[PDB]
Every structure is written in structure tokens, then in C-alpha cells.
Amino acid sequence: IVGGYTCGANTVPYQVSLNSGYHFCGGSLINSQWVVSAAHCYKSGIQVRLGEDNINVVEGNEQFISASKSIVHPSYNSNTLNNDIMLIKLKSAASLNSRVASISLPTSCASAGTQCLISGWGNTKSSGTSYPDVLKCLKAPILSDSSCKSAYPGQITSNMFCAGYLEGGKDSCQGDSGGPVVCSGKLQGIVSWGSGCAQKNKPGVYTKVCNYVSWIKQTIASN
Numbered sequence: 001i002v003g004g005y006t007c008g009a010n011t012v013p014y015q016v017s018l019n020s021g022y023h024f025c026g027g028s029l030i031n032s033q034w035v036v037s038a039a040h041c042y043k044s045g046i047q048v049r050l051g052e053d054n055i056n057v058v059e060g061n062e063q064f065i066s067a068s069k070s071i072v073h074p075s076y077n078s079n080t081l082n083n084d085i086m087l088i089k090l091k092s093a094a095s096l097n098s099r100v101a102s103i104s105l106p107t108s109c110a111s112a113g114t115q116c117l118i119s120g121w122g123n124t125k126s127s128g129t130s131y132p133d134v135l136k137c138l139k140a141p142i143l144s145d146s147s148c149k150s151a152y153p154g155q156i157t158s159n160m161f162c163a164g165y166l167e168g169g170k171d172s173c174q175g176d177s178g179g180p181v182v183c184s185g186k187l188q189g190i191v192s193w194g195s196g197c198a199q200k201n202k203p204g205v206y207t208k209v210c211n212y213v214s215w216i217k218q219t220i221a222s223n
């Protein structure tokens with residue numbers, strides 16, 4: 001996250017770190033046994049880390065659980081990143097508390113101009129590299145579809161939306177991938193892609209969760 005702030009330990013209770021010997025992607029807890037993340041974060045041997053603040057310090061509120069199953073969307077296209085969403089089932093149920101909570105799925109899509117909260121442990125530099133140890137947060141509005149498509153001609157599908165600031169300076173970045181975009185208390189996006197981070201006229205691109213609710217609910221119920 002570039003131009004964001006330190007969230008504060010366990011202020012984003014649904015945020016999860018995906019670890020395979022190190023942090024590689026974020027994710028969201030949707031219930032005691034399932035996490036939603038980006039299909040492009042798929043890896044074999046994932047461990048889910050919950051209630052995390054500093055990813056390099058064990059502060060006592062963490063729950064580390066291995067994944068039993070990973071399901072990438074049936075129509076995920078790695079070339080275009082269309083349908084960039086995957087579900088992860090935990091080996092055992094997480095214990096929910098003040099610092100580990102699930103986020104609700106939306107009952108409808110969000111309007112452009114709606115303010116959202118994006119979070120992660122990704123790079124904090126526009127052009128350079130600096131990875132934080134603590135969770136970073138960022139408030140950003142959903143951009144109009146025309147602004148999104150103008151920034152990335154021929155690359156935006158109906159399963160994507162843009163959020164941020166056209167003037168640059170504030171955005172999600174690499175390391176944030178699979179992380180939550182919460183608007184009006186519902187999970188509306190997953191950190192997917194972009195061009196650089198916080199560059200002018202190149203806002204972040206997110207998977208549009210409101211289009212996958214029925215697939216998420218049907219998949220979870222049969223697995």
C-alpha cells in the first residue's frame with residue numbers, strides 16, 4: 001500500500017496473510033472455514049495466518065492454519081486476469097474473536113464514488129521497494145467505469161472495477177494481491193492488478209466480488 005496509514009493491530013479483523021515460508025498475498029475470511037483471495041496468488045502449500053499485525057513478530061493473537069483445499073475460479077484466465085478469485089478451505093475452523101472476524105459478502109454491487117478500505121502488507125513505494133512489517137490501510141473511492149477503461153484500453157472486463165486516485169500517490173501495490181476492498185461493511189473487491197503503483201492515471205484494478213456471490217455460496221456448500 002502506497003500513501004496509506006498504519007491500521008493499528010487488529011482493526012481489520014478479516015484480513016489474512018497467505019504464507020509459504022514467507023508472506024506472498026493477502027486474503028479475506030468469509031466464515032470460520034473459508035478464505036477468499038486472488039486466483040493469481042495460487043500456490044501449493046499455503047498456510048493461512050490470522051489476527052496478524054506485524055508479520056515478522058509473534059505478538060500472541062495469531063492463528064496459523066494450513067489449507068486443505070484450493071479452488072481457482074473455473075474461468076480464470078492468467079493472461080487477462082479475468083475472474084481473478086480463488087477460495088481456500090482451512091484444515092480446521094478458525095476461532096473468531098475481536099481480532100479475527102469474517103467479512104460479509106455483498107447483497108448488491110457498489111456505486112462509483114463509494115468510499116472503500118483497502119489493506120495489506122505490500123510495497124509502500126511508488127517507484128522503489130520497501131515492504132512494511134505492519135498492516136497498512138487506505139481509504140479510496142470506486143472510480144467510474146469510463147475512467148477505468150480509459151486508463152486501461154481493451155483490458156477491463158465486467159468482472160473488474162478500478163478504485164483510487166487518478167492523480168496518483170495513493171494505491172495498493174505488489175504484496176497486497178488477494179487482499180480485501182471493503183465498502184459499506186461488505187467485501188466488494190480483491191486486490192488484482194495495476195500498472196506500477198500510485199502512478200498518475202493508472203488506478204488499481206480489483207476483482208468485482210458482487211458478480212461471484214452465487215458461485216462462492218454454491219462452492220462453499222459443496223466442499
Ligand SMILES: CC(=N)N1CCC(Oc2ccc3[nH]c(C)[n+](Cc4ccc5ccc(C(=N)N)cc5c4)c3c2)CC1
Pocket residue numbers: 079080081155171172173174176177191192193194195196197198203204205
Ligand atoms: C493483457 C491483460 N488483459 N493484462 C495484462 C497482464 C495483467 O496485469 C498483470 C498481470 C500479471 C502480473 N504479474 C505481476 C507481478 N504484475 C504487477 C502487479 C501485480 C499486482 C498488482 C496489484 C496492485 C497494483 C496496484 N498498482 N494497485 C499493481 C500490481 C502490479 C502483473 C500485472 C492483467 C491485464
Ligand SMILES: [Ca+2]
Pocket residue numbers: 009053054134
Ligand atoms: Ca505491531
Ligand SMILES: [Ca+2]
Pocket residue numbers: 052053054055056057058059062
Ligand atoms: Ca505477528
